[model samples]
Target chain A: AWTPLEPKLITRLADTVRTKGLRSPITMAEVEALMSSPLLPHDVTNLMRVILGPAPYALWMDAWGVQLQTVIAAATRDPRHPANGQGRGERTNLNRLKGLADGMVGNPQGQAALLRPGELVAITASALQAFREVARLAEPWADIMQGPSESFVDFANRLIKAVEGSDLPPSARAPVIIDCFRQKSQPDIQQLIRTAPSTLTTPGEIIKYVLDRQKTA
Target chain B: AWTPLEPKLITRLADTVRTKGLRSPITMAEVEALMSSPLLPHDVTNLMRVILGPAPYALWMDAWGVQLQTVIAAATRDPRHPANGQGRGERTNLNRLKGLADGMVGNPQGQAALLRPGELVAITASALQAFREVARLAEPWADIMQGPSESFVDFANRLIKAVEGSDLPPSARAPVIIDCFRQKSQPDIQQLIRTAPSTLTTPGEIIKYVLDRQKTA
Candidate 1:
């Protein structure tokens, strides 16, 4: 099947990167130092600057989404690959996994918070789909499907509703609600279904309800 | 083929619930809200209250790395099955991707600035990990990864070294650094490989150097 990567969506992604974003820990001093590094590649340094800087961030908002394809490919690759953590010996090549996930979800709440509650509710459905793609990319090597936490539809609804009810702005409310989800809900949900049955269902029912009513005509 | 799991690791992950981390955005009020929630199961709620709350983060004056594999497995997850975005939806999910990545990196720096570097660094790692994990659980879909800002191991190491070099007792330095590494650096490093490759190659070479030296020993 052909991959479904679209530009309109990516443009919004760029907009999100432009408007909502992660503050760079790499200071101007660091960028200057990187530029000066004999070891660091010139083009790569510029790439880093661009990626870490605001321009690529805004330009490639979709970069985060599509980038997962690369992470998944690496994860699914023969253990011989550099990021495979195989031939590398003792140290695990977890960065490939960790970095992939970090890139994918690092500032999800930012976008979630900025999005209309309906949009956030809808996006989680896709976020969950992205997770499954990891399994797909790493197919035969990793099995990602299964668990209570996979309820994109339900959580999306909860997240949207939580954001709406909260006394915070989209900025504050989104992150705050998300933090609440992380600190409060996520652990519990993980626990609730850790050993539960395979027949468990998603929150899709309610999400469908919310979606049916809220979907744009 | 073996399942994408380490049950031993799974059993031990609970320790992370205890001594793993702290953060600024997670306030006393949030903890209180968790404790009072009727939504969560009893034992889990009790554990959060007793384990995490009511403490000035214990400063281990006699810090030494205890191989607390106690909860290491809890954090051990296969990256291939990332439970975020997946499938053939229009780019609504992708749009959310940039939004999330943007916020993931940006928001915490402002709040984290108020805390001690070690504490803030560790908290940021946990906070973002929880967010990604939740997204993963929510969707059986996308191939999301942790973000760049969240995986600042080099910055974390600098902070640890700074803390170590400070007037803090030598008794404290080793164990504190060890704790910081296990709790903060380990996880960040785990995710960094996937999210950020360029940075990984450099450190990996250094690791190769150290290991190459070990052959004679």
Candidate 2:
């Protein structure tokens, strides 16, 4: 006997059959609906193209989709690249230089289609500066930050740990946290600015070295 | 000798010869320095595909290349209902989305080929947020803005006008301003937030809705 159809596979099969001019229908309700509003050949082609457009690109590959498996597989495959090259360590301490690079280029539209559009929008937004100002001006910034090399995820952890060693507001921790990236990445930041005149960081002066033309290498 | 090649046709012929086989060192040099790196195969089929990736879908009628072109042409043909049936605007948007999605989901080792590995880091980053915010806070932002339905090009023009007018302290605008995007898009911001929770923006927030969401019915 033929096996029962997987719902997704069945949907895909129906879509294919429709494109091929075969009249296989999904549910009786769908069949009845189609009978009432027959799609013209043009409409059929358009609909098929729309659906098929995303299939090859792997629409099912979100963190929530089947592609999550590929991400996992990629992550496990090597110790060199973590989070697919976002760089590893505590989330806070990780530089995320590459992430910053991509966002600057306005590549989020691509990311938004398969995943969520808004999430794409939120990535690399204004909050960073707000976080930076709130934290950097506060006394806790220099007091707690061990250094810039600590990944963001770890720094957040250490910030929590340092509380046992001292008292500070979460906002106060922002400066040191933000500074961590700024300090370690000063040279990298300078190089980035020098390389991409079109995509410089906000407040270009914040990356002092490059702005000052201090390229020693 | 063959008739002199059109500048454009020379590009096409150069591309064709490179793809067919860089059997000739001159063509190989042409491809390496002027075209793609010589490291890749010098084959006609592959060369044409890369050169023709941006062709209109109807032009893609040649064969497999048609598949890529058909989608691009269709997407760009209508700003709405882009890339077959996805809701993003324009063919370029579709391709970029497909590229990043392909990388994030399809190949682990080759993710960069599809999507720049660092891009997601930037989008979900403070850099992006800062760039948009700097522009939003610019003096010109006080105006109604190039109207809600303006195209990306218009939005960019208005943003620059706002920046020039905002009269912000140089230090304040520097970081975010540097990271600003060259092209602007009016995507569904709220939807994007729902999709990527790791992003910098808080959905339903002020100014964001006006800037990111479409005014379309």
Candidate 3:
């Protein structure tokens, strides 16, 4: 039942902040002084320095009150992603959305991993950590799932480690753990996780449930 | 919650050119940009477009014919700002509070440095140029930031440039900018951008907030 927040609505909320402000007149008093000397304080100088500094996420995070969580969320639930349509408008819309998110989020390939499916606490949190390592920098921790040689338990543990380290709520880990456990494992493993007893509430319990059956098999 | 094109235009305009003075912000670049855009005589005027466009502040001095200082001297003693103190002395209270802003802008150095309340054009030219430079940097919003040795005004200007180009709302930039400011500045200044005294409604307010630091200092 968990999912990452819908970025469509978040960006839309962000849009309101941009649109609502009425631009006011600028004073020459402030202008010339700025152009000339330090009729100012040290604090302003610091602001000026960072304002002109590099890195988009650092700036957006600092200046826009936009959280990385927001970016992760935006990338997590993109609506215009390619598979949704083959139309030109869809392509253009997706490109534009990517351009905007890419500016602040800065990792196209990692973001793609999240595009695979959905959001909720589990999916979003899992995808969130996956993208977090979407380095400027990684194969990225995202696109995370079972590797060909990995065991089902190992995969579950890995996802657990990744999500736990993500700093998302602790209780939120199960879905992210389960989702990846299902998606990353072999199809046979996925069906096993899918049909696991609903009474098993935790990732560990579910894993044991499947393992127990495997022993019987 | 959405604005109509017409009312949005007039609202943005009326806020800018209060018959008494400036209630809104401006720079000639926005106006020039407006004039350069396709226009219709029967509908919105170039003046209206520029004023209503991304930036509009000069028409009061040119087309509509008002003095620059007239716009400058116009009281910005807006009720929109938080009023001066707790409601205690009923009689001297309101007047005492109104006196701070109504008495006219800032400290002696702050006020004197302010173009003698007559340096309006010089202010507009600088602000316009800064915005234009920022526009050139607008290909991606994240790419814009304060240079290591950057001037606060220039950085703020370029930031405004990036904000408009990227469709970030004007009202939102202050917090975002301030948020960045806090992380990037020294301890003293970080507090400067935040303390309630400097509550920012617009990014431009950052300057006034700093200028006034010396007002009582």
lDDT of 1 by residue, A149-191 (tens): 4554555544555344322223333333332332333454444
The DockQ-derived docking category for candidate 1 is incorrect
User: Using lDDT as the measure, which candidate wins?
Assistant: 3
lDDT of 3 by residue, A1-217 (tens): 1123234533543344234421111221222223232111111222223322234324322432233335445544665433333444332223322223343244443444333332212222322233233211121123465766667667766666555544334444554455445555767777776676675556678788778775333
Instruction: Report, for every candidate in turn, its global Cα lDDT versus the true structure.
Output: 0.32, 0.34, 0.39
Model 2 B-chain TM: 0.20
- What TM-score, over all chains together, does every model reach? 0.17, 0.16, 0.22
Candidate 1 chain B least-lDDT 10 residues: B59-68
Interface RMSD of 1: 16.7
How big is the positional error of residue A59 in model 1, measured in Å on the Cα after superposition? Answer: 5.6
For model 2, the superposed segments whose C-alpha errors exceed 4 Å read: A1-217, B1-8, B11-150, B153-213
lDDT of 1 by residue, B1-217 (tens): 1112233432333244444333322332333333332111112222333433343112110110111111122213322212221343321221122112333333433322322333223233333333323322222101122244543434444645344333333343443332233223345353433343343223334334333432231
**DockQ in order:** 0.02, 0.01, 0.01
Instruction: Classify candidate 3 by CAPRI docking class.
Output: incorrect
Rank by lDDT, highest first: 3, 2, 1
Off by over 4 Å in 3: A1-217, B1-38, B41-144, B169-174, B185-188, B194-198, B214-217
Best by TM-score: 3
Q: CA shift at A168, candidate 1, in angstroms?
A: 28
Candidate 2 lDDT tens digits, A1-217: 1122245644764566446422222322342333233222222223333333344213211211232233335444664433333455422211122122323233433322322222222222222222222222222222344344543335444554443223233333333233333433335552554455553333323334344553444
Angstrom error of the Cα, residue A77, model 1: value is 16
State the DockQ, from 0 to 1, for candidate 1.
Answer: 0.02
